[PDB]
Design a binder for this molecule. Structure first.
Ligand SMILES: [Zn+2]
Length: 323
């Protein structure tokens, strides 16, 4: 009986030296992400809407144009909602589908439904169009390195549909896409042909980007079983800072601070956390002041903070994958 699902417990990063850190900092472009990955997503895209369809096509097209061998899958399902039965579609993008282990980055691509108010439309810029754009920019910036994957370990991106409640949060009205996908992965043998391990055993770590894009985010270290990876984010941020590779950034105002949060935050990681998947929840506490208001828009995003986080995230992923 193979002990491969335990490998994630001992997995260590392959740390980048200074010359490599400068290369990564220079290889990501916040302006290109802004124009080509983010702006197209800053539209009304609640589940089942025309914008949901447009967001999904945009995400798939941006992944499809890359050199790395991404395999795209649309996980479409029905769920009861306060408005009756509806259809939802999670987007899953995977490098090396049969590899046993994957580091997984995730966000939700739906936007919360609101009827238009005084000609304003809710586009959830931090929630979570920016996280979506960061995943696409990471795939683009690291494309050459990811092409080399073509430790039986690779990368997977998941864009959840239906994270938001159609009304206000309730156990049954929220997390539609993640509750569905977690159950599906838990009941899917992995790798193909396995007798007793599932796709969830294959998830090394679920890194969920959430509510990112506002000024001065502070991310708490939520879980003891991913604490050592939170510490790696702290170390990466500190070194990129010391090398002068971050913009408008100080250690007093660092993003990854030494501090826990004992409460529960309802989000897409929950259905995975409750089935035993290690999670690194990159959500700030407190939430952006514009949370769930029409002001969660492009104008209120902090460009240099998103740029700094792109650099930190890309370095984390390369180090985790030994690339
Ligand atoms: Zn929200």
């Amino acid at each position: 009986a193979s002990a491969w699902p335990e490998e994630k417990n001992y997995h260590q990063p392959a740390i980048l030296n200074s010359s490599a850190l400068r290369q990564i900092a220079e290889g990501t472009s916040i302006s290109e992400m802004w124009q080509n990955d983010l702006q197209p997503l800053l539209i009304e895209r609640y589940p089942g809407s025309p914008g949901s369809y447009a967001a999904r096509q945009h995400i798939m097209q941006r992944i499809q144009r890359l050199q790395a061998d991404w395999v795209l899958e649309i996980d479409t399902f029905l769920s009861q909602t306060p408005y009756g039965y509806r259809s939802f579609s999670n987007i899953i993008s995977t490098l090396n589908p049969t590899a046993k282990r994957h580091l997984v980055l995730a966000c939700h691509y739906d936007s919360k439904y609101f009827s238009h108010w005084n000609n304003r439309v809710f586009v959830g810029a931090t929630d979570s169009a920016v996280p979506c754009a960061m995943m696409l920019e990471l795939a683009r910036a690291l494309d050459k390195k990811l092409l080399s994957l073509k430790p039986d370990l690779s990368l997977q991106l998941i864009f959840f549909d239906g994270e938001e409640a159609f009304l206000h949060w309730s156990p049954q009205d929220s997390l539609y896409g993640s509750r569905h996908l977690a159950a599906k992965m838990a009941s899917t043998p992995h790798p193909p042909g396995a007798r007793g391990t599932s796709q969830l055993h294959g998830m090394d770590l679920l890194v969920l980007l959430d509510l990112i894009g506002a000024p001065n985010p502070t991310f708490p270290n939520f879980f003891p079983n991913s604490a050592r990876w939170f510490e790696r984010l702290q170390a990466i941020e500190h070194e990129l800072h010391e090398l002068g590779l971050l913009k408008d950034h100080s250690l007093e105002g660092r993003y990854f601070q030494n501090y826990s949060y004992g409460g529960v935050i309802q989000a897409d990681h929950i259905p995975f956390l409750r089935r035993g998947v290690p999670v690194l929840h990159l959500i700030p506490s407190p939430f952006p002041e514009v949370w769930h208001t029409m002001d969660d828009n492009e104008e209120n995003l902090d460009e240099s903070t998103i740029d700094n986080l792109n650099k930190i995230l890309q370095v984390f992923v390369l180090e985790y994958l030994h690339l």
